[PDB]
Design a protein around this ligand. Structure first.
Ligand SMILES: *[C@@H]1O[C@H](CO)[C@@H](O[C@@H]2O[C@H](CO)[C@@H](O[C@H]3O[C@H](CO)[C@@H](O)[C@H](O[C@H]4O[C@H](CO)[C@@H](O)[C@H](O)[C@@H]4O)[C@@H]3O)[C@H](O)[C@H]2NC(C)=O)[C@H](O)[C@H]1NC(C)=O
Ligand SMILES: *[C@@H]1O[C@H](CO)[C@@H](O[C@@H]2O[C@H](CO)[C@@H](O[C@H]3O[C@H](CO)[C@@H](O)[C@H](O[C@H]4O[C@H](CO)[C@@H](O)[C@H](O)[C@@H]4O)[C@@H]3O)[C@H](O)[C@H]2NC(C)=O)[C@H](O)[C@H]1NC(C)=O
Ligand SMILES: *[C@@H]1O[C@H](CO)[C@@H](O[C@@H]2O[C@H](CO)[C@@H](O[C@H]3O[C@H](CO)[C@@H](O)[C@H](O[C@H]4O[C@H](CO)[C@@H](O)[C@H](O)[C@@H]4O)[C@@H]3O)[C@H](O)[C@H]2NC(C)=O)[C@H](O)[C@H]1NC(C)=O
Ligand SMILES: *[C@@H]1O[C@H](CO)[C@@H](O[C@@H]2O[C@H](CO)[C@@H](O[C@H]3O[C@H](CO)[C@@H](O)[C@H](O[C@H]4O[C@H](CO)[C@@H](O)[C@H](O)[C@@H]4O)[C@@H]3O)[C@H](O)[C@H]2NC(C)=O)[C@H](O)[C@H]1NC(C)=O
Ligand SMILES: *[C@@H]1O[C@H](CO)[C@@H](O)[C@H](O)[C@H]1NC(C)=O
Ligand SMILES: *[C@@H]1O[C@H](CO)[C@@H](O)[C@H](O)[C@H]1NC(C)=O
Ligand SMILES: *[C@@H]1O[C@H](CO)[C@@H](O)[C@H](O)[C@H]1NC(C)=O
Ligand SMILES: *[C@@H]1O[C@H](CO)[C@@H](O)[C@H](O)[C@H]1NC(C)=O
Ligand SMILES: [Ca+2]
Ligand SMILES: [Ca+2]
Ligand SMILES: [Ca+2]
Ligand SMILES: [Ca+2]
Ligand SMILES: [Ca+2]
Ligand SMILES: [Ca+2]
Ligand SMILES: [Ca+2]
Ligand SMILES: [Ca+2]
Ligand SMILES: [Ca+2]
Ligand SMILES: [Ca+2]
Lengths: 387, 387, 387, 387
C-alpha cells in the first residue's frame, strides 16, 4: 500500500464507455434494497465502491414514507461494491449522515458524514472506519459537503463544505485532511458566488472542483486550489449551461448567469485547458435525460458551439444528481488520471405518484476508443405495491 | 497480532461524536432481521463488531411472539459488523446464550455465553470460536454476566458474574481469563451491595466496572480491580443518579441510594479522578431518552451540580440498556484508551402494543473536538403487520 | 497448512457443553432458508462448518412439497459456518447429492456426494471443490454413505458405503482416500451384519465407526480399521440400546439384538476401552428427545447399568439423526482429539401435519468441566403458512 | 499467480460426472433470485464461477415481465460461485451487457460485455473489473459474442464476435486479447458459413471453437486458430447433428446441412483427432432433454454411428443453451486440460404460460471413471404466483 501520487494529468477522452448499472429500484420492487439518494463512486487502489446515504428504510416498505425529506436522524452513509444493489446483506456501514463525502488516499478510506442539527450540524470524519476528527457548523444553517468523492494527493485529501443560505450568499471553506485529521482550512473570499455539492478531482498534483450554484447561477461555479489551499474561483464560461434548471443554450458568462439560476442540481465537469467535458440534463426545467458534451473552448469561451454530444439517458427518462470520480494510475496502471462519472436516476417524489423517493445509478468511464450514445434509464414502472 | 497492552489511561473527552446507527427495527419491518436484545460493541485491533443475543426469530414473524421473555433455549449470541443490521445473511454465530460477554485480547476473540437452566446455568467460554472452559451456577438462581464487553490487559481478559436473587443480596464473582481459560476467580465480600450487568473498561493497566443495582440502589455500584483480582468497591456518589428508575437529582450517597433503588437498567460511567462521565435515561421512571452528563466531582461528591450535558436521545423516545466499549490504541494509533458507549433502543413490549420486543442500537465515541446534542431515536412506527 | 496427524487419543469427557444451535426452521418461517436434512459438522484446522443436503427448495415455499422423499435430482450438498442458517446468501455449494460425506485432511476439503439413479448411483468425490474421482453402485440398490464426517489420518481420509437392501443383508465397503482419489478399498466379510450411515472418528491413528443396523439390530454395529483397511467388526454390547426404534433397556448382546431391530436412526458412540459414550433418543419408538449416557463397561458388557446421563433434548420434542464430529488438536491446541456430536431436529412429516420435512441442528462438545442437562428443541410451532 | 500455459492436450474422457446444479428457478419461487439467461462457467486457478446476463429483475416480480426479450438497457453481466443461485446478496457485478464472454488468463479476470444499440453496439472489455478497451459494431446489426468462456493461452485470451444478419451471411471476426486490450483482429473469409455463440476451448496451445449456424446449418460450424489468428474453418461432419432444431440423424455433411438448418441453439463439442464428444438436445424440434454422444469418427465421418450415449436431461424436460468450459492443470494439478460443460435449463416463455423467462444451470466434468446417465431437470412447477 502506497499513498496516491495524484501527480499525472487527466487523460483526454473521446467518449464515455458504460461501467456500471445497478437497477436498484427495479430489483427493490420485491427484494431487500435500501432507500437511498446521493449515491457516488470512489475507488481504492484495489476496488471501486458505490457510497450512498440511506434513509434507514427499504423500498416498498412503509418506512420509505416521506423520504423526499433530505435530512433525518435515520439516514446513514453505507457502501457496497460497484454495480451491486445497496442491500443490508452486502453493504458496509460507514457513518450516520445526511450529507457526505469519501475517498481513499492510497492506504485507507476517509469518510466524512454530517449529522448535528440544522442548527449546529457536526461532520464526523472516519479514517479506516475510526472517528478521527469533527467539525461543527459555523453558520448554524445546514452544514453540508460534496455528496461525491474527495480528492487525494500525496497523502492529503481535500474537500469543500457550505454553511448558510442556499437562497443567498453562504460561506464556503476548503479543507486539507491527512489520515482523517483536518490539517488546515480556509474561508473563501467569494462574494456573489455560491458553492454546493462540489464534484472534485485531482489533476497534475492540484485539485479542481465543479459545483452547484443554488442561488443565482445556471452555469456551474468552480474552484481550484493547490495543496496549501491557495485557491482560484470562477464560473464555467461556456454557453452550454451545465446546471438544471437553466436557460436554453446561448452566449454564456464567466460570472453567474442570472437567468434560471435559482435552484440547481449536483453536477460535474472536467477542465482541459480552455476545453471542458460538460455533463448535464437534457430537459432545461426538470432532471430528465443526461448527455455528455465536449466544448473545446467552453471553459473560457462564452459561445454555445460544441464538438461532441453523447447520449447517456433518454430525454423522457428521469435523472438526477451527477458527479465526478476518478480511477488513479495506481489502480489502472495507466500513465494519467482516468476521468469517470456517475449518474443518479431519481424515481418517486416529487415527480411521480409515490410515497417514497430513491435512486439508481449508472456510471461511465472516459475512453479514446469507440463509444455510442444510448439511454440507460432506471426502468422501473411506478407506482409500487406500497404505492 | 500482539496482545493488547491496556496500559494507557482513558482519554479525557469534551463531547460524544456519533459513531454508528443501525435502524434495525425499521429495516426489519419487511427485511430479514433478527429479534435481538442486549446488544453491545467490542472491537478487535482491526474491526468493531456489534454482538447481540438473538431470540432465534425474525421481526414481523410469528416466532417473535412473547419475546419479552429474557431466557429460552432458542436465544443465541451472534455478531455482525458495526452499523449493520443483525441478519442471518451477514451475522457470525458465536454461542447459544441468554446472557453474554465478549472481548478481544489482541490475538483472538473470547466469548462467554450462558445457558444451563435457571436452576443450574452453565457459561460456555469460546476462544476463537472454540469451547475452552465452562463454569456452572453456584447459587442455582440465573447465572448471569455483563451483557457488554469484557476488558483485556496483557493477555488477560476480566469479567463479572452474578448468581442469586435480583430482589436481594446475591453473590458476585470476578474472573481472570487467559485464552478462554479461567485462570483465577474470587467471591466479593460485598454485603448490602448488588451487582448486575457490569459495563467494564481497562484503564492504566487495571479494570473498572460500573454496574446495575437491581436490589435497592438508584446510583450505580462500581468495582475496580488489578490483574490479581484484588478488588475495591463502592457506589458512585454523584447526585446525578445514573440508574433507571431513580429519584429526581438531589444530594447523593456514596452507598446505595434506597429511594427508587429497586429494578434498574444496564448502564455505564467513566471514572476520571474525582470526576465522572454519566450516561443515563432522561425519564426517571421508564427508559425514555438518553443524555451524557459530565460531573467534574461526581465520583466522590454527593452534590447534583454538573458542568456538561449532551443530548443523545429525545426524552419522548424509547431507550434501554447502555454500555461501555473502548477502542484501544492498538486499533486507533492514539496514545490513550478511547472511551465510547452504545445505546439500546428497545421497541415493542412492555411499553408498546406489540407481541414482540427488540432493539436497535446507536453508538458514540468520546472526542475533544466539537460535538452537538440531538436525538437519534429508533424511529420505527409501531405496531407492525404481525402487530 | 499441515496434514492432520490423527495420532492422539480421544479426550476423556465428563459432560457435554453446548456449542451451536441454528434455529433454522423458526428463522425459515419467513426468511429464506433451505429445506434440508442429514446435516453434519466437520471442522478444518481454522473453522467449523455445517454441511447439509438441501432439497433445492426453501421453507414455507410450495417447492418444499413432498420433501419427505429422500432422493431426487434437486438435492444438493452445501455448507455454511457453524450455527448459521443454511441460506442461499451464506452457503457454499459442494456437490449434487442425496447422500454425502465430508472432511478436511489438514490441507483442503474432501467431499463425497452421491447421485446416479437408485439403479446405478455414482459418488462424486471433490477435493478443494474439484472432481477428483467417482465410484458407481456395484449392487444397483441405492449406493449410500455416512451422512456425517469422514475421518482423516496422515493425509488419508477414510469412509464407508452401503449398497443393497436396507431390509436384509447388503454389501459394505471401506475406502481409503488421499487428496480426493480412492487409493484402496475392501469389501467386508460381514454376514448377518448391517451397516448404514456410519459416524466415524479417528483415535490413536486408527478409525472407529459406529453405524446403523436397519435390518435386525437395535444396538449399534461398529467397525474399526487401520490405515490399510484391516478391519474389525462387532456390535456394541451395552444393554443401553443406542438405536431407534429399540426395546426397553435390559441385558444386551454383542451381536444384533433382534427385538425392534428393524429400521433405525443414524447415530454415534465413542469407544473408551471397555466404556462407551452413548447418544440416543429418549423415546423407544419415535425420534423424540435426546440424551447422553456414559456406560463405563458398555462396549463389552451386556448389562444396562450406566453412570452418567445428560439431558440434551426433552422427551416430548422432536429429534432425528445424530452423528459424531471431532475437533483435532491442530485446530484446538489440545493434546488429544476432542469428541463432539451434532443432533438433527426433524420437523414436519412424517410426524406433523405439513407438506414438508426439514431439520435444525444443535451441537455439543465434550468437556471435563461442569455441564448441565436441559432441552434445546427446534422450537418452531407448526404448521406454517404454506401448511 | 502465473499465466495459464494452455499447452497440454485435452484429457480423453469416458463419461461425464455431475459437478453443479443450482435449482435457481425453484429457489427463486419465493427467495430473491435474478432473472437470468445465457449462463456460463469459467474458472480461475483458484475457483470456478457462474457468469450470467441478468435482466435487472427478480423472479416472481412484475419486473420479470417480458423477459423473453433478449436485449435491453437493464441487462447486466454478473457472477457468483458455482452452484449458488444468482442473487443480489452473493453476486459480483461484472458489466452492463446483453451479450457477453469471460475468462481468466491465470492472473486476473477478463470480461467482455456488449451494449450499444442494435444500430451500433459497443463491447466493453474489463480486466480485473477495470475498463481496458472497447470495440463497436462494424455492421450495425447486433454486435454479439460467445455467451461462454473465452480461451486463454500464454497471457493471451481469444474470442469470436458476429455482426450482421442471423438470417443470412454475416461477418465474423476473431480477437486476440492481452490484459483486456485487443492486440490483433482478423475478419474471416467464410462465405456461406454462419458463426454465432461460439463455445471455445484451448487445446495443445491452440484454440478450437464450436458454434451455432443460425442461417442454414443443422450441424455445427467450427473454427480453429493459433495465437496469430491464423484460422481454419469447417463444419462437424458427423451425422449426429448437434444443433437444434435439426433433422433426424442420418448421413451428415462436412458443409452446412441445409435441412432444418435455420435457427439453432448455442452448443459445444470437443474435437479429439477424428473423434468428437457431441452434446445436444434430445428433441429435434424444441430444446428438450440433453445427451452426450461419443462419435469416434464424427469430426470427419458423415455416418450416424456412435459408440457412447450418456443421459443428462430427460427428453420431456426443458433445456436450452449449452457451452464448453475447461479446468486448467494450473487449477486441477492434472497433466492435461479437463473438458467440462454446462447446460442452461430455460423455464417460462416461450414454451410455458408465464410472463417471464429464466434459466437454471447444471454442469458436468469429463472423467474416465464410472458415470451414469440420469435426468437433472430444472424441476420447478410453473406457473408461479406472478404467473
Ligand atoms: C405515509 O405518511 C403519511 C403522512 O403521515 C400518511 O398519511 C396520513 O395518514 C394518517 C392516518 O390515516 C392521517 O392522519 C389523520 O388524518 C386523517 C384524514 O386524512 C384522519 O382520518 C385521521 O383521524 C381520524 O381517525 C382517527 C383514528 O380513528 C381519529 O382518532 C381521529 O379523531 C379522526 O377520526 C388523522 O387525523 C393523515 O392525514 C395522513 N397524511 C396525509 C398527508 O395524507 C400515510 O398513511 C403514510 N403511508 C403509509 C403506507 O404508512
Ligand atoms: C402469540 O402467542 C399468544 C399466546 O399463546 C397467542 O395468543 C393465544 O392464542 C391461542 C390460540 O388462539 C389462545 O388459546 C386459547 O384461548 C382462546 C381464547 O383466548 C381459545 O379460543 C382457544 O380455544 C378454543 O378453540 C380451540 C380450537 O377451536 C378449541 O380446541 C378450544 O376448546 C376452544 O374452543 C384456546 O383455549 C390463547 O388464549 C392466546 N393467548 C393469549 C394470551 O391471548 C397469539 O395468538 C400468538 N400470536 C401469533 C401471531 O402467533
Ligand atoms: C403438494 O403436492 C400435492 C401432491 O401433488 C398436492 O396435492 C395435489 O393437488 C393436485 C391438484 O389440486 C391434485 O390433483 C388431482 O386430484 C384432485 C383431487 O384430489 C382433482 O381435483 C384434480 O383434478 C380435477 O381438476 C382438474 C383441473 O380442473 C381437472 O382437469 C380434473 O379432470 C379434475 O376435475 C387432480 O385429479 C392431487 O389430488 C393432490 N394430491 C394429493 C395427494 O392430495 C398439493 O396441492 C401440493 N401443495 C402445494 C402447496 O403445491
Ligand atoms: C406485463 O406486461 C404486459 C404488457 O404490457 C401487461 O399486459 C398489459 O396490461 C396493460 C394494462 O392493463 C394493457 O393496457 C391496455 O390494454 C387493456 C386491455 O388489454 C386496456 O384495458 C387498457 O386500457 C383501458 O383502461 C385504461 C385505464 O382505465 C384506460 O385509460 C383506457 O382508455 C382503457 O379504458 C390499455 O389500453 C395491455 O393490453 C396489456 N398487454 C397485453 C399484451 O396483454 C401485463 O399486465 C404485465 N404484467 C404485470 C404483472 O405487470
Ligand atoms: C509521480 O509520483 C511518483 C511517486 O512519488 C514519483 O516518483 C514521480 O516522479 C511522479 N511523476 C511525475 C511525472 O512527476
Ligand atoms: C505499554 O505497553 C508496551 C507494550 O508491552 C510497553 O512497551 C510500554 O512500555 C507500555 N507503555 C507505558 C507508558 O507504560
Ligand atoms: C503426532 O504427529 C506428529 C506430526 O507428524 C509427530 O511429530 C508426533 O511424534 C506424533 N505424536 C505422538 C505422540 O506420536
Ligand atoms: C507447458 O508450459 C510450461 C510453463 O511455461 C513449460 O515449462 C512447459 O515446457 C510446457 N509443457 C509442455 C509439455 O510443452
Ligand atoms: Ca442553479
Ligand atoms: Ca464553445
Ligand atoms: Ca423478504
Ligand atoms: Ca436500581
Ligand atoms: Ca457534582
Ligand atoms: Ca435398528
Ligand atoms: Ca453397563
Ligand atoms: Ca423475501
Ligand atoms: Ca441451425
Ligand atoms: Ca460416426
Amino acid at each position: 500500500s502506497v499513498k496516491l501520487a495524484g501527480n499525472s494529468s487527466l487523460c483526454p477522452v473521446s467518449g464515455w464507455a458504460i461501467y456500471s448499472k445497478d437497477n436498484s429500484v427495479r430489483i427493490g420492487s420485491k427484494g431487500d434494497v435500501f432507500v437511498i439518494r446521493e449515491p457516488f463512486i470512489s475507488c481504492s487502489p484495489l476496488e471501486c465502491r458505490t457510497f450512498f446515504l440511506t434513509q434507514g428504510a427499504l423500498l416498498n416498505d412503509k418506512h420509505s414514507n416521506g423520504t423526499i425529506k433530505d435530512r433525518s436522524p435515520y439516514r446513514t452513509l453505507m457502501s457496497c461494491p460497484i454495480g451491486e444493489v445497496p442491500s443490508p446483506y452486502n453493504s458496509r456501514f460507514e457513518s450516520v449522515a445526511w450529507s457526505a463525502s469519501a475517498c481513499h488516499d492510497g492506504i485507507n478510506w476517509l469518510t466524512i458524514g454530517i449529522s448535528g442539527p440544522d442548527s449546529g450540524a457536526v461532520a464526523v470524519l472516519k479514517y479506516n472506519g475510526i472517528i478521527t476528527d469533527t467539525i461543527k457548523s459555523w453558520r448554524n444553517n445546514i452544514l453540508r459537503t460534496q455528496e461525491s468523492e474527495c480528492a487525494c494527493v500525496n497523502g492529503s485529501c481535500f474537500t469543500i463544505m457550505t454553511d448558510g443560505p442556499s437562497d443567498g450568499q453562504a460561506s464556503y471553506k476548503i479543507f486539507r485532511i491527512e489520515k482523517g485529521k483536518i490539517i488546515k482550512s480556509v474561508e473563501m473570499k467569494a462574494p456573489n458566488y455560491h458553492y454546493e455539492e462540489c464534484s472534485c478531482y485531482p489533476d497534475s498534483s492540484e485539485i479542481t472542483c465543479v459545483c452547484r450554484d443554488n442561488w443565482h447561477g445556471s452555469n456551474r461555479p468552480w474552484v481550484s486550489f493547490n495543496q496549501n489551499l491557495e485557491y482560484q474561483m470562477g464560473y464555467i464560461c461556456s454557453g452550454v449551461f451545465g446546471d438544471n434548471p437553466r436557460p436554453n443554450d446561448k452566449t454564456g458568462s464567466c460570472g453567474p448567469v442570472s437567468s434560471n439560476g435559482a435552484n440547481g442540481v449536483k453536477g460535474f465537469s472536467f477542465k482541459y485547458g480552455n476545453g471542458v467535458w460538460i455533463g448535464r440534463t437534457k430537459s432545461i426545467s426538470s432532471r430528465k435525460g443526461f448527455e455528455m458534451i465536449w466544448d473545446p473552448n467552453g471553459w473560457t469561451g462564452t459561445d454555445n458551439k460544441f464538438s461532441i454530444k453523447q447520449d447517456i439517458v433518454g430525454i423522457n427518462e428521469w435523472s438526477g444528481y451527477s458527479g465526478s470520480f476518478v480511477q488513479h494510475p495506481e489502480l489502472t496502471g495507466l500513465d494519467c488520471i482516468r476521468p469517470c462519472f456517475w449518474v443518479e436516476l431519481i424515481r418517486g417524489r416529487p415527480e411521480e405518484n409515490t410515497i417514497w423517493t430513491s435512486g439508481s445509478s449508472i456510471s461511465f468511464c472516459g475512453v479514446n476508443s469507440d463509444t455510442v450514445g444510448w439511454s440507460w434509464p432506471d426502468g422501473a414502472e411506478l407506482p409500487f405495491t406500497i404505492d
